Write a protein that binds this ligand. Structure first.
Ligand SMILES: Cc1cc2nc3c(=O)[nH]c(=O)nc-3n(C[C@H](O)[C@H](O)[C@H](O)COP(=O)(O)OP(=O)(O)OC[C@H]3O[C@@H](n4cnc5c(N)ncnc54)[C@H](O)[C@@H]3O)c2cc1C
Ligand SMILES: Cc1cc2nc3c(=O)[nH]c(=O)nc-3n(C[C@H](O)[C@H](O)[C@H](O)COP(=O)(O)OP(=O)(O)OC[C@H]3O[C@@H](n4cnc5c(N)ncnc54)[C@H](O)[C@@H]3O)c2cc1C
Ligand SMILES: COC(=O)c1ccccc1S(=O)(=O)NC(=O)N(C)c1nc(C)nc(OC)n1
Ligand SMILES: COC(=O)c1ccccc1S(=O)(=O)NC(=O)N(C)c1nc(C)nc(OC)n1
Ligand SMILES: Cc1ncc(CNC(C)CS)c(N)n1
Ligand SMILES: CCN(C)Cc1cnc(C)nc1N
Ligand SMILES: CCCOP(=O)(O)OP(=O)(O)O
Ligand SMILES: CCCOP(=O)(O)OP(=O)(O)O
Ligand SMILES: [K+]
Ligand SMILES: [K+]
Ligand SMILES: [Mg+2]
Ligand SMILES: [Mg+2]
Lengths: 597, 593
């Protein structure tokens, strides 16, 4: 069939029309010359809300935050050259964390491409490795098709970003030819039989397990029923649950079967359970190097069970690229995890109880809590204490709470000390680990959920990366609450410098501006707290302030995040907290640094 | 043959030594996990100074500014993943304007590459199109070699950016075996024939024009030899945006800047010239205008073998890429201009030519709507005043800018006479370049008065680097011409999109309170009567300082050549026309603008 309904419109107007067809209600971008034809077409358009940042990187991170909080793809619209290169980090970031995002970059006229034209860049070539797919629209006739392919690829399989390059002559051009109706409109029986066979094997293996553990990640959150079916399986088979950083919120941590987070900085109990389980059921997780520890030492008991045909590893993965990439698995259940958990449920034998397993796990829970050096008379506020208190204060409001963070120690403490209970409430950069993600992600998340209490638990160095977006929050009308755990250092780096480079802190201390005065200059309320006795009141004021507000908390310095598994250590070969050792290490630091730190 | 001076050292330590060998006195960077082995080796290093920004984009632009003012390559040292991708814009920018830069990016250990490792990115792939050359060091043995190739490449031919990916396990590795000493230490006829033919063609020239660009500035003797040739053969000189400062504009033979927003006189001379002598310029689309209508007289002079276009280009790829030339002199421009000088007859006069040119000079000056009682301050006026106030200081002045109208007005209304004093982003046109570039330049020339003439929107892009200026000890002077808009875009929206300002007005923070928060002095001026006093206080302030000047909004940059217009089909200023447009904008925007 042929469609003539677009004949007569410009590329920009067609773009405008395709947005509402793709159910897009929000667009994040920054205007420019090459992209003018599209902006003129979306001028005053009520098809969607437009959010304007101060920098394109901000638009990209806002879009990611928006996508993480809404489940819908984040749409970015920037110009050619510098406008496009400024979104590479956000794309690389979405690529690592599987975030759906469609990036539209204006380009110079097709007749100028390859002539080193003004503001011309080979964005398709540049974003090749950090997008699931990209393309340069060569004619207005193919604009609808490309847009549709972009949204489909970004939101299917493992979500991810895609880039569509838009030559100025294509968007300014008028469609003078009818186009295929298909290009304008947004399961083998053997395959299904094969998946079902996988599910049956997975079920049989699970019914055999004596010490099972559910290793859950971001994949379970890519379906509305994910958390529900996960809990059902957990309850039904009495299986303890541990999640990755990106899986936090998928399992109710108030549940006794919760093991909390695993990994480099995960709860020792979670790591021990994984190192001792006879069966690891990986659900929507990719065994990244921040989770497995020394891979040759990863899950010894599951490895032993496999050698004896009584266990091993089961993996519910949607992408073939991540199947058997890091570790050999016994059974790979291809496809959407939630969908496959639903099909397998009936084949799982209800389990009365696992007393020994749970008893062992409970001994660990008593022995390895997230211990740290708490406040003492006259001391500075402890960062971990701030998270604990804010978590309670925020939870007690009864509102829907969303948490975004920067990258570093504050990020890990937010992950460890916050009590996660709801899906899609923790938005953080994990794969690429982009400092500066906190503020813009929060702004985007707030646009997605106007009624939610959105908190950006940020670090001082991370915050500096993108602090210019503070005025954007005001202009966007997003009452975000910015929390800066200021230790006047790049904590995560100084930590590694403390542990592996004998306290030699090389250029890891940046000079911060007055955050409170900065906040006021940017248009929002600014609050500071440095005294222990004022923390509670300030957190209260912080959370109940009506518009956007920033709260800086001066926190102790050179405080390591523990437990910790690094180098060639196994998940069960972690460094635990020890007040005596911290005191000795502090003394050693003052000497080695010549009293500078 | 073999060398062992590095044996026993880590890749990081070797890196420290190599910086010394390459005579590097400044490194711009931001630490990270993957690049830790190197940061530990340069800890409290006496080999060079380190400048720390708040964002890697800042580091990149700081290194570009440094390179532009010192003539030395800018060295960047960042971590893997986000650290590397955050430097893509600066590399793309340096690639477009031909700026020497060596970007060192930490990378995850080689045993982790290709596994979607923590903070891993295909940096070599990402930066292929925006670097003259890049590589990933596979072993500490080849580290000295790669570093030497990088600096050599970044500084030869047309200067540009290069990237060297450093795997963590390589920089942490200790060199055990000795390495080749050669890897540890930092046709001619056809050219001569062209030099001779060029000389003759310049002799048969009756209406010659020197079209100079950034190339002339890539050699210490460039400006001097340019003046020599200009005086010797009495030839009027016009420069591109990147050429400003290579020719004294106080000289009667100065045509000023040409192009889209260049001086009308400059464009007319080019369109009527019988011989155009292109020196270190690439005929970009911001200079030529409608290529078909470019240099009509030179094309006719070429058809009659009595003129045309002579091009002094160092890069073969840029010869006959835009327009077909009659004579091409490959190699360094300055060098070839020196070997051609003698073969040039001293023209003692060019009355007819200079007469016509001066005729345009009188009718086509940089005219604009000047201030009137009770009106706002005009941006062009601020540029002219500051230009004078800065000069009266007597010290060396370097100027950086953001991207947009303020950038063009800075180029037109400032009197350029010194080389390497105008640092602006032209090829890629990166907003936010002003501040970090200034900081980089101030580091290169500690004694100079560095001024960043910025726009409000451009400033917002990288304003976080204000605190970096304070930490770096760079007393830069930040000037913000605030019209609360994206000038260049709104201008295009006014001219070509019926005054439909689609998202070109950003909400600005309080620049003065911002400056104070960042740790520097903040000054603001709204009244005409206070402009002069503020400008003086501005430049005479010791440390870093920011001065915001509220200027008239919706003021178009003129003259202008866009679309299918020839350089001679420019739009000139008219006071009555501006009043008409102002009334039309008001009607169309419902009084909003
Ligand atoms: C300072 C710092 C410290 C860190 N410390 C830790 C730590 O200690 N512990 C930790 O866990 N992480 C940590 N990380 C984060 C870490 O790098 C990884 O980003 C995170 O572990 C990845 O979790 P994930 O596998 O669950 O999600 P992803 O990386 O998003 O991987 C999801 C996986 O699920 C699959 N999948 C996706 N959608 C579906 C679907 N619908 N159906 C089935 N399968 C699907 C994917 O294709 C993929 O294989 C840290 C990061 C930083 C910046
Ligand atoms: C808002 C905006 C408006 C603009 N408006 C204008 C305008 O109106 N007019 C204008 O002129 N520009 C304008 N530009 C800038 C413009 O895009 C180009 O960046 C600039 O014209 C390029 O000048 P250039 O050719 O001299 O330098 P480059 O682009 O750096 O090109 C230099 C050329 O010299 C050659 N060369 C380099 N080194 C040597 C050497 N040692 N020996 C011999 N040859 C060498 C190069 O390889 C190349 O071909 C504008 C930019 C922006 C952001
Ligand atoms: C990025 O610009 C381009 O896309 C472009 C690139 C090369 C040649 C011709 C053009 S163009 O003639 O078709 N358009 C153009 O120059 N535009 C759209 C533009 N917009 C703005 C806001 N400023 C300037 O120039 C200073 N040019
Ligand atoms: C950037 O990280 C890497 O380069 C790396 C990447 C993949 C596997 C192993 C490593 S590593 O073990 O060799 N190093 C490492 O993890 N580093 C150097 C590191 N540095 C900092 C500052 N934080 C963290 O982790 C939270 N890791
Ligand atoms: C970094 C960046 N983003 C966007 C633009 C968009 N263009 C102009 C010239 C106008 S605001 C630019 N020049 N630089
Ligand atoms: C934990 C990492 N770190 C401080 C290095 C780093 C530098 N720059 C950016 C944008 N992100 C980062 N994660
Ligand atoms: C790992 C990044 C550095 O600094 P930041 O201040 O953002 O965080 P923290 O100091 O909490 O690790
Ligand atoms: C190129 C446009 C953007 O804005 P900016 O505020 O930097 O300046 P101008 O308004 O001078 O164009
Ligand atoms: K928790
Ligand atoms: K001038
Ligand atoms: Mg910090
Ligand atoms: Mg402006």
């Amino acid at each position: 069939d042929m469609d003539t309904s677009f004949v007569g419109l410009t590329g920009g107007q067609i773009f405008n029309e395709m947005m509402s067809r793709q159910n897009v209600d929000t667009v994040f971008g920054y205007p420019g010359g090459a992209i003018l034809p599209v902006y003129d077409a979306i001028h005053n358009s009520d098809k969607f809300n437009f959010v304007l940042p101060k920098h394109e990187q901000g638009a990209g991170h806002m879009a990611e935050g928006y996508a993480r909080a809404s489940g819908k793809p984040g749409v970015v619209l920037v110009t050619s050259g510098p406008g496009a290169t400024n979104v590479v980090t956000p794309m690389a970031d979405a690529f690592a964390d599987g975030i759906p995002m469609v990036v539209f970059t204006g380009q110079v006229p097709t007749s100028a491409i390859g002539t080193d034209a003004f503001q011309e860049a080979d964005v398709v070539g540049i974003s090749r490795s950090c997008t699931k797919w990209n393309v340069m629209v060569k004619s207005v006739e193919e604009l609808p098709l490309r847009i549709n392919e972009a949204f489909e690829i970004a939101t299917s399989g493992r979500p991810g970003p895609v880039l569509v390059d838009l030559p100025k002559d294509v968007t300014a051009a008028i469609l003078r030819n009818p186009i295929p109706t298909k290009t304008t409109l947004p399961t083998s029986r053997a395959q299904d039989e094969f998946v079902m066979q996988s599910i049956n094997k997975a079920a049989d293996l699970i019914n055999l397990a004596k010490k099972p553990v559910l290793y859950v990640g971001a994949g379970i959150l890519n379906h509305a029923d994910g958390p529900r079916l996960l809990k059902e399986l957990s309850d039904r088979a009495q299986i303890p649950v541990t999640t990755t950083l990106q899986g936090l919120g998928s399992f109710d941590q108030e549940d006794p079967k919760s093991l909390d987070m695993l990994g480099m900085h995960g709860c020792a109990t979670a790591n021990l359970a994984v190192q001792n389980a006879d069966l690891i059921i990986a659900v929507g997780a990719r065994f990244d190097d921040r989770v497995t520890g020394n891979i040759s030492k990863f899950a010894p008991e599951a490895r032993r069970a496999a050698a004896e045909g009584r266990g091993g590893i089961i993996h519910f993965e949607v992408s073939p690229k991540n199947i058997n990439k890091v570790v050999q698995t016994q059974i790979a259940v291809e496809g959407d995890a939630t969908t496959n958990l639903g099909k397998m449920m009936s084949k799982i034998f209800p389990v009365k109880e696992r007393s020994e397993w749970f008893a062992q796990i409970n001994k660990w829970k008593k022995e390895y809590p997230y211990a740290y050096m708490e406040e003492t008379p006259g001391s500075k506020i402890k960062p971990q204490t701030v998270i604990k208190k804010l978590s309670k204060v925020a939870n007690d409001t009864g509102r829907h709470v969303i948490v975004t963070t920067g990258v570093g120690q504050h990020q890990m403490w937010a992950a460890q000390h916050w009590t996660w209970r709801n899906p899609h409430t923790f938005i953080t950069s994990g794969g690429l680990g982009t400092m500066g993600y906190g503020l813009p992600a929060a702004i985007g998340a707030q646009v997605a959920k106007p009624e939610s209490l959105v908190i950006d638990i940020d670090g001082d160095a991370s915050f500096n990366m993108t602090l210019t977006e503070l005025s954007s929050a005001v202009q966007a009308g997003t009452p975000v609450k910015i929390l800066i755990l200021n230790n006047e250092e790049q904590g995560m780096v100084t930590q590694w410098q403390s542990l592996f480079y004998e306290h030699r802190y090389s250029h890891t201390h940046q000079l911060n501006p007055d955050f409170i005065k900065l906040a006021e200059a940017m248009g929002l309320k600014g609050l500071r707290v440095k005294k222990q006795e004022e923390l509670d009141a300030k957190l209260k004021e912080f959370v109940s302030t009506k518009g956007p507000v920033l709260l800086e908390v001066e926190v102790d310095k050179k405080v390591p995040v523990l437990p910790m598994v690094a180098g060639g250590s196994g998940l069960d070969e972690f460094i635990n907290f020890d007040p005596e050792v911290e005191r000795q290490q502090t003394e050693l630091r003052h000497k080695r640094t010549g009293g500078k730190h």
